Amino acid sequence: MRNEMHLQFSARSENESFARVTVAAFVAQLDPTMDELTEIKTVVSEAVTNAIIHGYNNDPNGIVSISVIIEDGVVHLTVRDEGVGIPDIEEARQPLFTTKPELERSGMGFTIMENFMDEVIVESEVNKGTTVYLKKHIVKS
């Protein structure tokens, strides 16, 4: 099977929960583990939050863009923002690394993404935006 979904919303914190719910519903069609679902919910949270607090520095006029395509047991998740961008993507991936520690940011986001999914590709250009591609095969019993 092949099913695609595209969601666009305002860069607002309430919507982090919103995206988690939406994505989870869309991926439920693959009848995955509760852990697989939780992992997928978490990752969506990490990426969407990043886009909001880092990408748009909490400016509610920014447009977070998520798009999930599920097919033959694999999930292709994409979170994108036309925001600030990431200067050194390699540096930012380091566990515990953060550029906003005074905001109680733990620097665990990316480390969680890379571990809850099978593959993570981060692409970004300063001042253009950031795009996070997350792949994931859903074990089917």
Partner: protein, 117 residues
Amino acid sequence: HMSLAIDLEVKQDVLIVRLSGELDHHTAEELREQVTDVLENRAIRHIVLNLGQLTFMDASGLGVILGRYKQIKNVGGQMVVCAVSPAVKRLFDMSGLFKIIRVEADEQFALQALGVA
């Protein structure tokens, strides 16, 4: 706030924070406010965090928690987390920043380790 219910109870120099719902950036902001709010009106030495009814947590949870942790270290007190689901435990071990913070089984053991209960 939203999707996260905060239950606060103070026992002679110990703040008990009982969370029930989902904890993410948005909801964690409401938690930080409400708590540092008690820390301002009362002399709190310790904090016992009951995550028994915690449905979900992302990195923001690790953040707001370590945020309180600091407020307590500056007063020589300690923080105890209890009733942690495996999902939350995974984010704790994974961040590794919780080899510091004390983790107990239930609110009794936590309070007990502090001296109260």
